[PDB]
Subunit: 214 residues, 6 copies
Amino acid sequence: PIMVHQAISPRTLNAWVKVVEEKAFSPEVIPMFSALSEGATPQDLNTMLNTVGGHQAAMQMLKETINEEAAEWDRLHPVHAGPIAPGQMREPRGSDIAGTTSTLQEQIGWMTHNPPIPVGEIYKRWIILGLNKIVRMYSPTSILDIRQGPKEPFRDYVDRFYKTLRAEQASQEVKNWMTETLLVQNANPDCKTILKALGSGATLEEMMTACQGV
Amino acid sequence: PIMVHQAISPRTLNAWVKVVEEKAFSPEVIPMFSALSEGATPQDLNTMLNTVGGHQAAMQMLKETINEEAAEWDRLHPVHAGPIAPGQMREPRGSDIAGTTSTLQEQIGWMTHNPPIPVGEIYKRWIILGLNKIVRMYSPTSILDIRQGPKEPFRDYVDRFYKTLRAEQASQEVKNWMTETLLVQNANPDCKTILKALGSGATLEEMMTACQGV
Amino acid sequence: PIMVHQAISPRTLNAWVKVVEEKAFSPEVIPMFSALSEGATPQDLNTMLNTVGGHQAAMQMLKETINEEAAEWDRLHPVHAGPIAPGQMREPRGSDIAGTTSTLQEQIGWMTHNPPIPVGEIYKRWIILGLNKIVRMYSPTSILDIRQGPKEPFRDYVDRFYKTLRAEQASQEVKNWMTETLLVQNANPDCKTILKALGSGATLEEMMTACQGV
Amino acid sequence: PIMVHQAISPRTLNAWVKVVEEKAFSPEVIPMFSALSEGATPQDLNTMLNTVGGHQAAMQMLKETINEEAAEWDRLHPVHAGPIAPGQMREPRGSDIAGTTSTLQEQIGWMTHNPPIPVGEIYKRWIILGLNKIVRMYSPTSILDIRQGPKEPFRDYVDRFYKTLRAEQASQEVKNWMTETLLVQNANPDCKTILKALGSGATLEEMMTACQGV
Amino acid sequence: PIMVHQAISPRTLNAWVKVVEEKAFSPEVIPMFSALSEGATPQDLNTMLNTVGGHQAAMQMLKETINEEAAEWDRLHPVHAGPIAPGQMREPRGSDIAGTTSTLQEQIGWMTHNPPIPVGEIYKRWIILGLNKIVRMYSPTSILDIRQGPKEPFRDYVDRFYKTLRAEQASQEVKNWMTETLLVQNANPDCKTILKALGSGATLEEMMTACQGV
Amino acid sequence: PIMVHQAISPRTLNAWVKVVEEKAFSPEVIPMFSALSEGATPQDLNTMLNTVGGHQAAMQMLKETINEEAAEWDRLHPVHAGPIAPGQMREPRGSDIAGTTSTLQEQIGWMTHNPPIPVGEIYKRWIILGLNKIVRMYSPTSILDIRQGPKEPFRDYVDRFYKTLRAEQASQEVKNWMTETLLVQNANPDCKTILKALGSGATLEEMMTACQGV
Ligand SMILES: [Cl-]
Ligand SMILES: [Cl-]
Ligand SMILES: [Cl-]
Ligand SMILES: [Cl-]
Ligand SMILES: [Cl-]
Ligand SMILES: [Cl-]
Ligand SMILES: [Cl-]
Ligand SMILES: [Cl-]
Ligand SMILES: [Cl-]
Ligand SMILES: [Cl-]
Ligand SMILES: [Cl-]
Ligand SMILES: [Cl-]
């Protein structure tokens, strides 16, 4: 990554490869990806994606999302005809942001220049957008089906609930509705009664400590 | 972390991930977290939290604590209306300290500027506050129940006592009362007699060496 | 690699060696190679190749490809007779780009000089060209033979399809034809009907989510 | 640690944690601790101690020793009343040296300032003092009980002798008396005769090579 | 290694040690050695050799080769009598290049001085010369004995051929003769016929793809 | 180690610890030690020795050798009475070189000052001197007892010979006599005849290749 240019480290690459083998597309893979690609050029971002073996339905799916975002960027940013003056550099296309039609030096130029054109962070947003689509498709369970089993420790039910909740790509408002509606509704009879008694404004801490004995 | 900005290292991230898998929320997890997040920006702190898979009841609980602290910061620090002058940067909100509504560059700006606004260390205190709440809730044993078993080496009883003591979030004054009261009271008959004979001002060293033979 | 010269790191070398032992010549080996050889001089590129034990039919094959590209470079770039002036350095031959007839200092000279002569990136392209030839020869399955089995989850069929597709060295236009023709054609009866109903312009996401239940 | 400030490295922390799990409080733990804490601030020293899980009787014992040394420092160094001038910084208390009542910046200030106030090395001496107390208490064998068994290779007896000797916290004069008295006295009959014949001034090398055959 | 002097890294040393234990004197050991000794002083080169345990017939053999090359250097470079002036440094002998009679500082002096006297790269060539002698002696199979077995995949026969070829220290002209003569001659009947039909100028790629079905 | 001071790295320390556990006092331990202690101050050298657990007969033996060398240094270098002037630093005693009576800063002073007083390299020579004494004492086999067994491959006999030779601390002249006398003398009948026929000036290479078939 990068403001002095640097190659992607052996142990960044290796760490990313192992993450995908072990955890596939579990929600936490996406923060790991972003963490390992901090300050990454499009070339470095493409490296991480291309070094993934297997999971090629998702990697192909990711390409289409990236292409869709590229087409959208080109629509909003039409390229103007003309010779690039000595002090300036050309406007990036969608394919330049995705790294397929731009050199490393062009990518370095845009990121470092005074008006920064952060193609690294733009392309990364496109990748993360497509990764979210994969997680949601690749999640086995639906949030609607998470119901506490009889004699299930609440703590284990809440772990399953917010884990499954974590893989829906839901906005904060949508995730807020699911919490106040499904969590208490789908608790088991013994603890559900207790939770109705806490009222309409109790924290998760209060709900978990309330059903700790039961 | 950071005064030159730096990305979170592959082996910092990986170390933190393994800590939580192996040790869950054992008291020592919190010092490990703080150690691995030294000089961290809110973006780096959020990275560590988001890269944790599982334990999503606690991670959700942690969000509420962070939001409570954010609401408290906003109450004490009301934002004033106006255009941010060239030489200055805006006042951070609670959400800016938690990183959700601020950019990396804004976080870098506050931490490096001459009046330092250490959003990293402020947000970290909020996270550590919530981590303490988790440890205490997630501790299986109570300090009141730690009693030395018949024929139990004192050393093993003291290990269990101060381990269980370690997970209560007790102030120094509260932890002091538990030591002078419960430790000797809940020792086994043979060693308890010996300890009453040491008097009301003996060190742990003297108590452990006194009951070494018995 | 390199603009200050640096030796190839112990853990770059070791990482590359393990990659080839574990994954042989699977498509992802090539992006891994390029990633680990970022900014590499021809000497560093030769190091990575020579440190590979076994697979000597491929490594020998790679030599011929490199020699073919060297012969082509010499044809296009004929060397002129004359003593190299103090301020300049000689024109590289194909063997100079491949590192066999040039010193490390000559390779450093070309890469750093004001008109950059990127022998590292030129030789790397020749190596990657030959690596593609190996992958295609060393691929066991043909893309034509990938047919979805009865009761096979589409997701698994698409994984096999784009994995096998990945090892053909096909241009984008050739890979595009295979997608729109073979993927739907070679699906199993139950899902194939569903896919004909999506129409002639649906994304992979829509095709995978359509055949998710079936 | 530090004269430019630096955070404690991931692999320093991890190394220290593993040392205590594997070797507990074996004499060599103390040199390992000092080695891993070279140039450490009190904050870094507290980190290493707090990240130790288990062994909480010793860690609590260590706190008391540190508090005793703190009380002693305060007695010898009484704090004077007054506002700290711009060019100077306040006098450290015992709690400031132990890091509990001082900030990282105050600790950095004292260590770097022209009259250096090495709170890191002072606090480290207090910690090492308490670690020695633990080793001696936690040693199972006494030096008095190490007697060479019949047919025991001297080399193995000398290994046991100086290992057990190593955990007594004995001054050089006390350890010198034990060598010249117990080592030869407690050897087995066959080798003991040989050693009396070497005389009152022979080296360990001469004693070991003398009893090599026997 | 080195133009600022540096000590050999822990992980360079360890990597080299493991290479020799696992792979002995397989052809690839020599490129690994050269890679790990890039920019090495004679002291660093001697370190790598001396840290090898076992294989002492080869390490002794290597000493003689180094001594032979040293004697040859002294013959070609006779030392002149005189006091070394302040601005200059003495001429290196063979033993100075091998590090046995020169200090680290003398080795640093020669490598860094304006007329560079690369004792590191000279001594390294002597070591690599002797390593080649070992590989050839320590190779179990002869290139003459590599014959394709009945029903042996050509690819496996070519792997064995160029592996065994790799350990002969043969010049390019000698290795060229073996390829065009033995490879086709010693193929099995079914594939041999096919290869005669390709003609006297076909690549390894064409030969391997020709005998792929057979 | 060091001309800017640096703390001993976590992975230097750990590497040294593992070396001694796995290989004890095999000849190669000594080059490993020297390699890992390149540029080490006496404090760093003492760290490596003190972090060794077990083997305390040898570590104690090493202390005596170091003390003997210290006494010898003091005899040759008598300390003169007087106050150390501002521009100068005091003369080191034997105990100052061994680090027991000197501070880290004094050790840094001597090593960096214009007339360098390399206490690191002096003390290291004393340690290496004592390590050689240990290896020789701790070697199980004598060079005199290495005789080639009937049907033993010469290569294996030469490995045993120069391995056992390696642990005698023999000068080059003493090791030279053992080679020309014992190696051929103690070979087995079949190969011994062959070696007498090579003559009185053949290399190890010629001797090993001569007895390769037999
Ligand atoms: Cl993310
Ligand atoms: Cl969520
Ligand atoms: Cl903490
Ligand atoms: Cl506590
Ligand atoms: Cl590639
Ligand atoms: Cl593809
Ligand atoms: Cl110590
Ligand atoms: Cl001792
Ligand atoms: Cl080589
Ligand atoms: Cl070859
Ligand atoms: Cl040595
Ligand atoms: Cl030897």
